[PDB]
């Protein structure tokens, strides 16, 4: 056993490895979305910038979980990062809806991880998840919902003018 | 023969003279486009500024080729600069489409020039073209494609509101 | 008729289009002269800089006429820019003499344009020409005459030392 | 066909998609290496920092290829990012040797890509690879070789003192 | 074989060793020229400074090739640096003509090296030569040609006044 | 005879030409040593920097002797710069020992030159050698001896850790 390990259940260690993979997955989904908006036939540069920023932030989230695993004396086991479920994200609205769905799935996983931590009487892990992940997820979901609402109300995706103006005035 | 001339084929020298003319031609097309948008019945001042900038940059491109000709010991032979193929460019979208077509033609000429240089084992000329022209052409073409896509998606040219807003938010 | 057009004769509009072409022509002559002095077998870099500056200023003069045409509600019709009457300008003195001849021809055209404006009772156009072109032409002609005189008195073109020293001390 | 596409072969487009995956793979290998050195039973924080830096730089390399694909009018098709071939990298020396092997494999792929570009007479792509990838690979390989040599000469991996001191004085 | 070596032909390695010697040779020729102009019976201090600068730059060029050899995993084999073909360089004009001849010979060698690199499908080496040597050679040759032309036109070498004034106004 | 020459014996002039060659030789030995330490299988970057610095300083020493020759009205006659007596310098310790041996040989030559100057009652030359060369040689020899002693005491060359640490803490 690692000399630092204390009050850290095998199941928690495994769940942290799964969460690392999920954050890396989310980073990859956002990378895909970003460069879709960089296509010459899509050409929404602030959508592209927005999603690239999200990609980089998800990598930071994954790295912090890798740090956590080592802090607690668990051992990192990486898995393949699955490619996303689309190559063509269709529109700004559709991408925002897919991001909302992704973030709700990441949140569900984090909530299950918190539940596990508290079932295993691991208050350090539970508060790590609280403090560094749960409110960031609520904020992310709220922002994506706000963006979806605005794009819908403006007439996206059929209005390319709506997506253009949202790109300029909200994301720029 | 010029005292500086070395490894510089007659055919390359001729092709550089043709390229000088083509860059000067492109400068003139953009000058024409610029002042079309300055007309009182068109009145898109950032389209005008955009194309004037492009005009001046094309002149810089031509001057650099004239410098190259002399660097290599070739001799500059200028030809008439043909007037453009339109006097009235119709709309912001139509002008952007014509600019895209122009830039692809300039690129085709540059690619043929690179091919000539490498057929004549002139690596200085090939890398001059690479380094100073080819990526600038890819960037120019990508930008014009992006602009065309946005104007189309916004509803141009029938939407004069689309062209107005693109002028303000992309070109301004 | 353009909504802005007022007191602007068809003949004046045509003459402005001709003048645009002449200023663009002068720009091209000076461009040619500039790079002649950049040849390795001529190699007078301040003659080259002088004439490149003149080239760029002539383009500014043309652009201001294009602006004028649109200000008055005329319509710009561009024509080919003829290549210059020489490829090899022979010497610094000979180029200065050709520039003097060019500027006197441009001045003659501007004077005819002023005469037309006043015959058509177009005081805006007459004072535009006065204010922005006529004294600039007198200054240009005087400077070129001064340069020709100095080069002749110094012994140019047979004295390559004269042209060298004029390049350094007058044009540098 | 994309409106921007010109002189861009299907095979080149496919090879760029493969290269994107390889750069993302390299980023993941370096991420794995980094956090191995963050383990409490390894505890070489400058090895960890070094490899994290490399991870982030490889992601930048991948993003630039994604930009290139879109610049040329190709279409990005992402694939899974395979997990690395080790979970436990054994030592500082062993990790540096694995990084050297990785970088030589990435270089081999880039060289094949350059060969393809030149076989398809795509000088823009060939010079993109030259300019942005090939010398960076030679530098990376040289640095890793230098590091391997020093660690070997110092007595690594059996000397944990050697790895400690290399971490402080070369990587810190 | 060196652990870093990849795609680096024996013939290329040998040619780089020859090029190192040639750049060191050029450095020595320029050193000789410099101090000729420092003689009390020659006494052209800006010719001396010009050629000393060139000497030091050629040493930098040689050092960069030595770095390249090691970057690629080749092995440096130095050879004697031959003394120059003159002790007395006769005049400023004659020295400039000898420098022009030298630089054209160095260029010829670099062009053969580029040809070798591309025959051996070594795009890193070909672009190293392009990027760091070929345009620097074209610029050097153009400058020397310009200097030769001016000195000839001014009346050198028989006019010691010409050489004096060129020393002051071009090289000073 | 040169108009400046006074109290300057033919033998002294010849000895200065020999000394110029010896300083250039020393510069070349140090250049060789420098890049040996830049090899990927040697990889001691501060040894490399140290010896490159010495190379450049020896060139300065040679240039000052060339200046001296001309100051006194002697005539510079350059000779080939012999390549060094090794291609592979084996180790940091071995290179330092070879440098010590070189510097003692240069010193011996300078001492013979001083003896010649004083035998020919040339106090300017004797004090030039004193003032600009003799103490610099004593300092150089002392430093190299100090370096040799430290490397020996630390366990070089068999301890690659010793050479690594000396590179960091003495030469870095
Ligand atoms: Ca435990
Ligand atoms: Ca457990
Ligand atoms: Ca686990
Ligand atoms: Ca899969
Ligand atoms: Ca799927
Ligand atoms: Ca699917
Ligand atoms: Ca589907
Ligand atoms: Ca909050
Ligand atoms: Ca030739
Ligand atoms: Ca030919
Ligand atoms: Ca021609
Ligand atoms: Ca025509
Ligand atoms: Ca027509
Ligand atoms: Ca027509
Ligand atoms: Ca028509
Ligand atoms: Ca290149
Ligand atoms: Ca780019
Ligand atoms: Ca009217
Ligand atoms: Ca009328
Ligand atoms: Ca008209
Ligand atoms: Ca014509
Ligand atoms: Ca004619
Ligand atoms: Ca004629
Ligand atoms: Ca004629
Ligand atoms: Ca008035
Ligand atoms: Ca005045
Ligand atoms: Ca194509
Ligand atoms: Ca194809
Ligand atoms: Ca593909
Ligand atoms: Ca797998
Ligand atoms: Ca495995
Ligand atoms: Ca395995
Ligand atoms: Ca195994
Ligand atoms: Ca480098
Ligand atoms: Ca090889
Ligand atoms: Ca071989
Ligand atoms: Ca060899
Ligand atoms: Ca010899
Ligand atoms: Ca001889
Ligand atoms: Ca001889
Ligand atoms: Ca002879
Ligand atoms: Ca240049
Ligand atoms: Ca004497
Ligand atoms: Ca004597
Ligand atoms: Ca002698
Ligand atoms: Ca020898
Ligand atoms: Ca030997
Ligand atoms: Ca031997
Ligand atoms: Ca031996
Ligand atoms: Ca002292
Ligand atoms: Fe997020
Ligand atoms: Fe996340
Ligand atoms: Fe352009
Ligand atoms: Fe262009
Ligand atoms: Fe003028
Ligand atoms: Fe004018
Ligand atoms: Fe890397
Ligand atoms: Fe990479
Ligand atoms: Fe040079
Ligand atoms: Fe050189
Ligand atoms: Fe020394
Ligand atoms: Fe010395």
From Swiss-Prot, chains A, B, C, D, E, F:
Expressed in the liver. It is found in: Cytoplasm; Lysosome; Cytoplasmic vesicle, Autophagosome. Keywords: Acetylation, Cytoplasm, Cytoplasmic vesicle, Iron, Iron storage, Lysosome, Metal-binding, Neurodegeneration, Oxidoreductase, Phosphoprotein. The record marks 18 as: Essential for association with cargo receptor NCOA4. Its main location: cytoplasm. It catalyses: 4 Fe(2+) + O2 + 4 H(+) = 4 Fe(3+) + 2 H2O. Residues 6-155 form the Ferritin-like diiron domain. Gene3D superfamilies: 1.20.1260.10. Fe cation 1 binds at residues 23, 58, 61. The keyword Protease does not apply. One of its GO terms (cellular component) is extracellular exosome. Changing residue 23 to A: Reduces iron binding and oxidation rate. InterPro entries: Ferritin (IPR001519), Ferritin-like (IPR012347), Ferritin-like_diiron (IPR009040), Ferritin-like_SF (IPR009078), Ferritin_CS (IPR014034), Ferritin_DPS_dom (IPR008331). It is an enzyme of class 1 (oxidoreductase). GO terms for molecular function: ferric iron binding; ferrous iron binding; ferroxidase activity; identical protein binding; iron ion binding; iron ion sequestering activity. GO terms for biological process: immune response; intracellular iron ion homeostasis; iron ion transport; negative regulation of cell population proliferation; negative regulation of ferroptosis; negative regulation of fibroblast proliferation. Fe cation 2 binds at residues 58, 103, 137. Its EC number is 1.16.3.1. It is linked to Hemochromatosis 5: A disorder of iron metabolism characterized by iron overload. Excess iron is deposited in a variety of organs leading to their failure, and resulting in serious illnesses including cirrhosis, hepatomas, diabetes, cardiomyopathy, arthritis, and hypogonadotropic hypogonadism. Severe effects of the disease usually do not appear until after decades of progressive iron loading. Neurodegeneration with brain iron accumulation 9: An autosomal dominant neurodegenerative disorder associated with iron accumulation, primarily in the basal ganglia. It is characterized by global developmental delay apparent from infancy, and progressive decline of motor and cognitive skills. Clinical features include delayed walking or inability to walk, spasticity with hyperreflexia, ataxia, dystonia, and poor or absent language. Belongs to the ferritin family. Stores iron in a soluble, non-toxic, readily available form. Important for iron homeostasis. Has ferroxidase activity. Iron is taken up in the ferrous form and deposited as ferric hydroxides after oxidation. Also plays a role in delivery of iron to cells. Mediates iron uptake in capsule cells of the developing kidney. Delivery to lysosomes is mediated by the cargo receptor NCOA4 for autophagic degradation and release of iron. Oligomer of 24 subunits. There are two types of subunits: L (light) chain and H (heavy) chain. The major chain can be light or heavy, depending on the species and tissue type. In the human liver, the heavy chain is predominant. The functional molecule forms a roughly spherical shell with a diameter of 12 nm and contains a central cavity into which the insoluble mineral iron core is deposited. Interacts with NCOA4; NCOA4 promotes targeting of the iron-binding ferritin complex to autolysosomes following starvation or iron depletion. This is Ferritin heavy chain. The gene is FTH1.
């Amino acid at each position: 056993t690692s000399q630092v390990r204390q009050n850290y259940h095998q199941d928690s260690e495994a769940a942290i490895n799964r969460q690392i993979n999920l954050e890396l997955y989310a980073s990859y989904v956002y990378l895909s979305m970003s460069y879709y908006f960089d296509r010459d036939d899509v050409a929404l540069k602030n959508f592209a910038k927005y999603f690239l920023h999200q990609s980089h932030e998800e990598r930071e989230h994954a790295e912090k979980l890798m740090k956590l695993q080592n802090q607690r004396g668990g051992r990192i086991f990486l898995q393949d990062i699955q490619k996303p479920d689309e190559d063509d994200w269709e529109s700004g609205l559709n991408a925002m809806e897919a991001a909302l769905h992704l973030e709700k799935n990441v949140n569900q996983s984090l909530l299950e991880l918190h539940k596990l931590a508290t079932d295993k009487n691991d208050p350090h892990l539970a508060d790590f998840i609280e403090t560094h992940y749960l409110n960031e997820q609520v904020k992310a979901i709220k922002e994506l919902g706000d963006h979806v609402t605005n794009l819908r109300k403006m007439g996206a995706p059929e209005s390319g003018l709506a997506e253009y103006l949202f790109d300029k005035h909200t994301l720029g």
